[PDB]
Design a protein around this motif. Structure first.
Motif, short mmCIF file in Angstrom:
data_model
loop_
_atom_site.label_atom_id
_atom_site.label_comp_id
_atom_site.label_asym_id
_atom_site.label_seq_id
_atom_site.Cartn_x
_atom_site.Cartn_y
_atom_site.Cartn_z
N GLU C 340 72.08 77.35 68.82
CA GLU C 340 73.05 77.75 69.84
C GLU C 340 74.48 77.57 69.31
N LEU C 341 74.68 76.55 68.44
CA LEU C 341 75.96 76.24 67.79
C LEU C 341 76.10 77.05 66.48
N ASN C 342 75.01 77.76 66.09
CA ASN C 342 74.84 78.62 64.91
C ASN C 342 74.77 77.85 63.58
N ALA C 343 75.64 76.84 63.39
CA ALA C 343 75.69 76.01 62.18
C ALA C 343 74.38 75.25 61.99
N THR C 344 73.68 75.54 60.88
CA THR C 344 72.38 74.94 60.53
C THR C 344 72.51 73.48 60.04
N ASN C 345 73.70 73.09 59.54
CA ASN C 345 73.95 71.73 59.06
C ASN C 345 74.38 70.81 60.20
N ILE C 346 73.76 69.62 60.28
CA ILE C 346 74.02 68.60 61.30
C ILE C 346 75.43 67.98 61.15
N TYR C 347 75.93 67.86 59.90
CA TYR C 347 77.24 67.28 59.59
C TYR C 347 78.41 68.19 60.02
N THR C 348 78.16 69.51 60.15
CA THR C 348 79.14 70.53 60.56
C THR C 348 79.47 70.39 62.06
N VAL C 349 78.44 70.50 62.92
CA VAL C 349 78.56 70.40 64.38
C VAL C 349 78.34 68.95 64.89
N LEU C 350 78.60 67.96 64.01
CA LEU C 350 78.49 66.50 64.21
C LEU C 350 79.15 66.02 65.52
N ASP C 351 80.33 66.57 65.84
CA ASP C 351 81.14 66.27 67.03
C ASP C 351 80.68 67.01 68.30
N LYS C 352 79.78 68.00 68.16
CA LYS C 352 79.28 68.81 69.27
C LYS C 352 77.79 68.59 69.61
N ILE C 353 77.06 67.77 68.81
CA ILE C 353 75.64 67.48 69.06
C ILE C 353 75.51 66.51 70.25
N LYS C 354 74.89 66.99 71.34
CA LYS C 354 74.67 66.23 72.57
C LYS C 354 73.49 65.29 72.45
N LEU C 355 73.64 64.08 73.01
CA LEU C 355 72.60 63.05 73.00
C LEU C 355 71.94 62.91 74.36
N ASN C 356 70.60 62.93 74.36
CA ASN C 356 69.77 62.82 75.56
C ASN C 356 69.07 61.47 75.64
N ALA C 357 68.59 61.11 76.84
CA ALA C 357 67.89 59.85 77.10
C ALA C 357 66.51 59.82 76.44
N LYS C 358 65.99 58.60 76.20
CA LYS C 358 64.68 58.30 75.61
C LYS C 358 64.53 58.78 74.14
N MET C 359 65.62 59.33 73.56
CA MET C 359 65.66 59.82 72.18
C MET C 359 65.50 58.70 71.17
N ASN C 360 64.92 59.03 70.00
CA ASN C 360 64.72 58.09 68.90
C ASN C 360 65.24 58.72 67.61
N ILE C 361 66.32 58.14 67.04
CA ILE C 361 66.98 58.62 65.82
C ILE C 361 67.05 57.49 64.78
N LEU C 362 66.68 57.80 63.53
CA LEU C 362 66.73 56.86 62.41
C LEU C 362 67.71 57.38 61.34
N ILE C 363 68.75 56.59 61.04
CA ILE C 363 69.77 56.93 60.05
C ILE C 363 69.74 55.91 58.91
N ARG C 364 69.17 56.32 57.78
CA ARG C 364 69.02 55.48 56.60
C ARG C 364 69.84 56.01 55.42
N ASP C 365 70.04 55.19 54.37
CA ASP C 365 70.80 55.58 53.17
C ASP C 365 69.98 56.52 52.28
N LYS C 366 70.56 57.67 51.90
CA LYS C 366 69.90 58.67 51.04
C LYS C 366 69.66 58.15 49.62
N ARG C 367 70.63 57.37 49.10
CA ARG C 367 70.66 56.76 47.76
C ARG C 367 69.41 55.95 47.44
N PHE C 368 69.02 55.06 48.36
CA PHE C 368 67.90 54.14 48.21
C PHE C 368 66.52 54.76 48.56
#
Lengths: 471, 519, 388
Positions: C340-368
């Motif tokens: 809907e935002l057209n941009a396929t990259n998450i880092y592009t529309v980073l400020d426009k991605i809406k967060l919903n309840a009961k969601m589960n997100i894991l953000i880990r380091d790419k390097r390791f």
């Protein structure tokens, strides 16, 4: 509108300036102090704290004390707002009995002891001088009583004991109130100590009322014995210490039963489960001034008077205390000519003793007042909080426990002059044990303690020659 | 209507600008600060938080404190709004007694305890007397008659003592005796009032023993650790009995069952700053002062804290000339120690104030919340537990200068109480004119001779180890050398070779008067 | 009269428009958001739910957090109304000791495959089964040094949660459960300055066959429940924190775990940190009252992300340096948004991605490198305090 900050019943105006209680038809009336009529009628000049509910910081209100809406058992001297209504109880031993574990029996004499500071040779730890902790500060807030076993061959062999054998101690004890307030139920815990620290046994017992200046196991009834679940156990080595000293110690705590309070609307005294003595008693011991006196009897009496404190502003609200007025309301001193005297005995006839900070506080005052003598500026000496003052009769001699031991040869011969011996003088009164002869009759006629020997000398002197004898 | 946000009684106007308490006829009066009248009368300048009931986050309100409508037992320094009224209690051991598990196979030594602040919690380290008990007691493991299979039972005399600012009226905290580092030996836990800066089993009464239901049990292997170290640890928790509160209309204090210390104590330990000081005595004192915090807005409501004013209200520092001093001892005479973030916070301030010295900008150094500051006397040396162990040879000679009595039986000297605290014992020897150093008291344990009298003078008795006999004067021209051994230099046990001699022990020259100068 | 529905303290006016807390003389002041002074002074724009007393659904109100009238132990990141002030505690094992029925140091880290932590027994200095002197009939008794450690945002004042030591997958060895010692967030229960806790009336019993599994794996599991002691609450009129016997964590904890979104991050340290952010839900109308959540602002208030140029970065490390992981429904919800935002990259529309309840997100380091739990002559490394 009536200006009352403490909501006691006494307004700010009367509480500060002066007040008293009088009877109209029958009704009780509170009125400001007028020397022109009230002093002439025969009334007491009362002055309390307008911001403190109880000046003495005791469970009874300032108003309750003066109007009489208080526990009737509370001492008449304590019915003054500047006098603390608090209890003090020590254990009085009547007689002892010693037998081998599975018999010697002597009568004991007990008096409340208020220990005096060490001389200038006695071994003390590094913390004794350390500011705050361990400091004895002349005399500390506690109940302790020293007993005296009758000296009148070899106790260790009279029972049939050896190094392996153990001796069991049993005695007749009585709880007796020396304070100003009554305990209605739970009795305090006490501990029998041999010598200095050797804790022998811990005794602790009901709804029998312990009245101030009255015995718990009332003289008309039988007293209490010592554990008859498990009795006191003593080894042979510790038994020889008791035989050598012929004395013991009784350390009683200040934890007492719930306080009975008055309720205005129903005019009835009820035992309040909420307020206990243990939560109110320290508040008194930090706001009031401690004064010890033995006028009526040569026994140490503890009475606290509402005193001023410069550090705390709420304690500055309490009326300024003088040595003159305090002694009058606390014990019963009278001012007939201008000089203070206790039932006849002049103020100069009594000795003045204080602690480190108490004497130093008065030292500054005596220099500011210029008069070096305490009896001169007697009416101008200000009393401060937490103070410890000891007043004793000059006619007698005093030990480390501050109790009457002996007297001068002029003193003993003066009461022993009659065919009849004075009760106060007789209190300090061919073998080491062949000395008991005095049998005091109920008519008031008899039919020193410091000089008598409880045990024979290194040479086994079972003779009255070495003993210092008088008329 | 009066503008008061914290419902205490002190209005927003006075609470922010300045206020004090004065007496009119007799009545207590709250008034704004006027240096022209109040400062001259002898009053203290108070300022607290208008949005906080208690600035120090303690159970006693800002009003209740200064007005005096509070628990009278609460410390006078704590009666100030910016000073925390909270209790801290450690276990003080008086003496120990060791026997085999079940007449003369029992060793008894006196112990010394002081509160230890390792370089928040309550921990105290004890010190078992190394000196002789019997005439020739050797190896504790054999003085009792124990082997690898045999077990030794420990028993001691202990006392609870308050070092805080607030009183505990009933329930005593739980404590645990630890051997060495983590070896938990035993856990001890008992309406007697524990007053601040006052002992629980009051000095006028007998103390408390250790379990006489089941006593402390120690194995042979763990007993050899105790014999080698001659010390133990006492870890006490901060869980205390219910707090007693004030009621305004009835002006009496009652024990509130609702509010306990465990629910209010952590709130203080997160809002205030910690300052440790050992001025009056070389014992570590913990006092917390109401400090500012930028993160929390409610803590920004608290008045800005300075190092100068905080030290004055927390311990008793005075400003006579302009330089801060504790009862006489100057601020410069005291050492300044901090943690990681505390020192780094002050590091930035010192650069912004330009002055690199802490004593220069002393009045301008700001205090922040959760800060930890340790102030100790420069005169003495400090271990890992931050307790006074020893001092410079010069400093020891200053206290032992005053001589009262010169006798062959004993030497009475007016030695300072603070200086003698780092002393373990003295060495007694007779130095020849020829140059021979013959030592009377010559062993690892033959050091205890100092017997402090109540008069204020330390009595050194050589007869203690000289078989109850005074020192023999072989020649009155001989030098009677009496040294001094600190606690840090003394040996609790002999060396690998079994060094039962005072030669290896670091001795400090303290007395060298000739035989004719004494007798 | 000023309208206030949740009665928290903050009106319906500010909770929707925008607000911040400032200090006048000394007094705390709540005022509407003014970019002309508040943004320039260095204040954070707060916005909560006007109908919900607690946006985060935690025992502490929207007001309690911003004004500071909260339990001071509560995390500074949690002092925001859109950040959950809730506790999470796992058991950290320091060292083990094995003996026959009558020693190696262990490393523990919280595992996110509930509270579960996997230990690691030191392999470094023959046959453990023979070093003790055991056989098929003989049994080995396990004993270890354990510590309770808080990773959440709220403090537990008394009762400790129940934990269970598991060998391999399901082989339940022993159940451990212990007081009034305060467990502070991001702070150890048996404080580092004091001695830790040992393991047991009757100790852990292990057979020879199960002992060979421990010798082969050199690792164990620690499953801890979320049942905690009573919560200490603030009382406005007397400004004092009291332990409320009525409200417990077990009755409030699930309410948070159904209204908020879960985000895992290991920036400061390579340890899995659980932080929940107040999220919107279309089904429930009361959750629609909560302000709309963005991935950008949530990450900033939950961990400490900063926007210096325009690109989000954690203390220096760019957003692109971190990997993006989700579940079935979470990734599918964002999948629709990215189209809907057209941009396929998450880092592009980073400020426009809406967060919903009961969601589960894991953000880990790419390097390791990360496994399934998302975390002998070899020991020589002795780390100096200099950083080498």
């Amino acid at each position: 509108t009536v200006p009352d900050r403490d909501n006691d019943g006494i307004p700010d105006s009367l509480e500060v300036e002066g007040y008293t209680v009088d009877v109209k038809n029958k009704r009780t009336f509170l009125s400001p102090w007028i020397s022109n009529i009230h002093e002439k009628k025969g009334l007491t000049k009362y002055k309390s704290s307008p911001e403190k509910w109880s000046t003495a910081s005791d469970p009874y209100s300032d108003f309750e004390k003066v109007t009489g809406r208080i526990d009737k058992n509370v001492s008449p001297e304590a019915r003054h707002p500047l006098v603390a209504a608090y209890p003090i109880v020590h254990v009085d031993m009547e007689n002892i009995i010693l037998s081998k574990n599975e018999t010697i029996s002597k009568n004991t004499s007990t008096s409340r002891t208020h220990t005096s500071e060490v001389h200038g040779n006695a071994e003390v730890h590094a913390s004794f001088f350390d500011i705050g902790g361990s400091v004895s500060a002349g005399f500390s807030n506690s109940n302790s009583s020293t007993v005296a076993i009758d000296h009148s061959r070899t106790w260790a062999e009279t029972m049939g004991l050896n190094t392996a054998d153990t001796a069991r101690l049993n005695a007749n004890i009585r709880y007796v109130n020396t304070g100003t307030a009554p305990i209605y139920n739970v009795l305090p815990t006490t501990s029998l100590v041999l010598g200095k620290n050797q804790t022998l046994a811990t005794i602790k017992a009901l709804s029998q009322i312990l009245a101030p200046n009255n015995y718990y196991p009332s003289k008309n009834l039988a007293p209490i014995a010592l554990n008859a679940s498990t009795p006191i156990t003593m080894n042979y080595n510790q038994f020889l210490e008791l035989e050598k000293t012929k004395q013991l110690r009784l350390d009683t705590d200040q934890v007492y039963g719930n306080i009975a309070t008055y309720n205005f609307e129903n005019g009835r005294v009820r035992v309040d489960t909420g307020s206990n003595w243990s939560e109110v008693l320290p508040q008194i011991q930090e706001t009031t001034a401690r004064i010890i006196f033995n006028g009526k009897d040569l026994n140490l009496v503890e009475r606290r008077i509402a005193a001023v404190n410069p550090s705390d502003p709420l304690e500055t609200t309490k009326p300024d205390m003088t040595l003159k007025e305090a002694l009058k309301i606390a014990f019963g001193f009278n001012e007939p000519n201008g000089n203070l005297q206790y039932q006849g005995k002049d103020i100069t006839e009594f000795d003045f003793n204080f602690d480190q900070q108490t004497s130093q506080n008065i030292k500054n005052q005596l220099a500011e007042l210029n008069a070096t003598n305490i009896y001169t500026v007697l009416d101008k000496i200000k009393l401060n909080a937490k103070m410890n003052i000891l007043i004793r009769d000059k006619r007698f001699h005093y030990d480390r426990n501050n109790i009457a031991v002996g007297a001068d040869e002029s003193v003993v011969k003066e009461a022993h002059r009659e065919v009849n011996i004075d009760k106060d003088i007789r209190k300090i009164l061919d073998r080491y044990d062949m000395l008991n002869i005095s049998s005091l009759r109920q008519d008031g006629k008899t039919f020193t303690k410091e000089n008598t020997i409880i045990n024979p000398s290194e040479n086994g002197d079972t003779s009255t020659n070495g003993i210092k004898k008088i008329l």
